[PDB]
Structure 1
Amino acid sequence: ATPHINAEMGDFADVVLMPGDPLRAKYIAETFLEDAREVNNVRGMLGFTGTYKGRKISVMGHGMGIPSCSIYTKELITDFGVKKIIRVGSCGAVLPHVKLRDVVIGMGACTDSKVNRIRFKDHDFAAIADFDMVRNAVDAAKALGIDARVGNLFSADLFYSPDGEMFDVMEKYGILGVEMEAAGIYGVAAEFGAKALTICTVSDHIRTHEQTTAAERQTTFNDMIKIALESVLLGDK
């Protein structure tokens, strides 16, 4: 066990799906996994392990922000033998052609956090996903008839940023979605030699002011989860 995860080696599968909300992790375990059992509840950050189409899968919340998800992902890798992490979250869009409920895959993640500069001698570390994991997700999405855009995400430290101008810069550079964790997960994956991918569903649009309701959530949330789970099966080959 660790100070944040009260479990032991073996309680987690080698692949873990991670939404930011622990309550969504419970929803995933009960809705998509069979024989799911709770393997962690320290700080209410619920984690479960079950099977999907016979394959052992774990799902656990990671909390909001780079510092929060960096703790859980590092521990899962070094203390629980996890090889692959797939964040399945929500994000806001800044591009006019990116619509509410669209699925976006972060091949890369920009950030205003200082964590990768601390790791990389203050130079620019391109926080990227594992290529095969990205391709697997794109193919699974295609199989399910869901188009997914692949590109850069922006992982913000401040949900309430005092710099309103940054959103225009993000739009100019083609950022597909604004969230708060991808760059941190990719930094941890690179630091400890694991593989990661972040998939998000657009839950709010910064330009149109649109927002998903309770219902709109579960529906598009389900598509992203199916993409993630099926992408794992393609990955096993």
Structure 2
Amino acid sequence: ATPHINAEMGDFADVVLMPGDPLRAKYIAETFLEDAREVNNVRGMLGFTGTYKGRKISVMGHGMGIPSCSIYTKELITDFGVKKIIRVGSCGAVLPHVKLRDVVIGMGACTDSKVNRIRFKDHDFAAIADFDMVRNAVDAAKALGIDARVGNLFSADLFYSPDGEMFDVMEKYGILGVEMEAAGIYGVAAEFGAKALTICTVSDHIRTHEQTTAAERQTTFNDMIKIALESVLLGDK
């Protein structure tokens, strides 16, 4: 076990899907995986392992924010033999043509966190996904007939920012979705030698003010999960 996961090597698949919400992890396990078993509940951060079309797969919450997900992703990689992490999250949109419930794939993740500067001697570390994982997601989505845009996310430390003007800058630079984790997970993946990808579903739009309910975020963003799971199968070929 590790300080935040009461499990043993073997309990997790070598690929883990990770939403921020452990309740979404539960819904995914119950809906998409066969023979699902709970493999963690420390701090209520539910994780499960099951099979999807014969392929062993795990799904576990990572909590909100870079510091939270950095803990779980590190633990999975060093102690549970996890090779790939697919974050399956929600994000806010700033772009006019990005719509509620759109699926976005974060090839890169910008951030206002200091964690990567701490890692990288105060220079700019480009927090990027694994290329093959990005391509597997894109191809899985095309096979599924689900649209998906690929580009930059922005991983914010403050969901409630005092600096509203930063959204104008994000939009200018083509940021697809604003969430709170991708850059941190990508940093961890680089530090500990694993592969990672963040896929998000647009749960609110910052300019139009539209949003989804907490219940909707918890269970209904299934397009991204299908993409994630099928991308794993492509990855195995």
TM category (shorter chain) comes to: over 0.9
Structure 2 counterpart SS, 1:175:
coil
What is the rounded CA distance, in whole Å, between the counterparts of 1:219 and 1:18 in structure 2?
A: 14
1:220: how far off? 5.3
Q: Which moved more, 1:211-220 or 1:31-40?
A: 211-220
- Describe how 1:111-126 pairs up with structure 2 within 5 A: 111-126=111-126
* C-alpha contact 1:201 1:220 (8 A) present in aligned 2: no
1:193: how far off? 0.5
- CA deviation string 1:77-129 (max 9, x = no partner): 00000000000000000000101010000000000000000000000000000
| Cα distance, 1:69–1:226 mapped onto 2, change above 3 Å | same
- CA deviation string 1:137-179 (max 9, x = no partner): 0000001111100000000000011111100000000000000
Structure 2 counterpart SS, 1:151:
strand
* C-alpha contact 1:110 1:183 (8 A) present in aligned 2: yes
1:13 corresponds in structure 2 to 13
1:4 corresponds in structure 2 to 4
What is the rounded CA distance, in whole Å, between the counterparts of 2:131 and 2:173 in structure 1?
A: 21
| Cα distance, 1:187–1:214 mapped onto 2, change above 3 Å | closer
Q: CA RMSD in A?
A: 1.1
* C-alpha contact 1:62 1:69 (8 A) present in aligned 2: yes
* C-alpha contact 2:155 2:182 (8 A) present in aligned 1: yes
2:62 corresponds in structure 1 to 62
What is the rounded CA distance, in whole Å, between the counterparts of 1:222 and 1:60 in structure 2?
A: 16
Q: How many residues align?
A: 237
* C-alpha contact 1:101 1:220 (8 A) present in aligned 2: no
1:217: how far off? 4.5
1:2: how far off? 1.1
What is the rounded CA distance, in whole Å, between the counterparts of 2:15 and 2:186 in structure 1?
A: 15
* C-alpha contact 2:16 2:82 (8 A) present in aligned 1: yes
* C-alpha contact 2:21 2:218 (8 A) present in aligned 1: no
- CA deviation string 1:47-74 (max 9, x = no partner): 0000000000000000000000000000
1:128 corresponds in structure 2 to 128
Structure 2 counterpart SS, 1:154:
strand
| Cα distance, 1:191–1:232 mapped onto 2, change above 3 Å | same
1:214: how far off? 6.1
* C-alpha contact 2:77 2:192 (8 A) present in aligned 1: yes
* C-alpha contact 1:93 1:205 (8 A) present in aligned 2: yes
1:215: how far off? 7.1
Structure 1 gaps, min length 5: none
* C-alpha contact 2:90 2:217 (8 A) present in aligned 1: no
What is the rounded CA distance, in whole Å, between the counterparts of 2:218 and 2:143 in structure 1?
A: 20
Deviating beyond 6 angstroms after TM superposition, the runs of 4 or more aligned structure 1 residues are none
1:3: how far off? 1.2
Say yes or no: does 1:229 pair with 2:229. Answer: yes
- CA deviation string 1:178-209 (max 9, x = no partner): 00000000000000100000000000000001
* C-alpha contact 1:140 1:230 (8 A) present in aligned 2: yes
What is the rounded CA distance, in whole Å, between the counterparts of 1:134 and 1:143 in structure 2?
A: 14
What is the rounded CA distance, in whole Å, between the counterparts of 2:145 and 2:214 in structure 1?
A: 24
1:212: how far off? 1.9
What is the rounded CA distance, in whole Å, between the counterparts of 2:180 and 2:140 in structure 1?
A: 25
1:218: how far off? 6.8
1:28: how far off? 0.4
Structure 1 counterpart SS, 2:75:
helix
What is the rounded CA distance, in whole Å, between the counterparts of 2:123 and 2:218 in structure 1?
A: 40
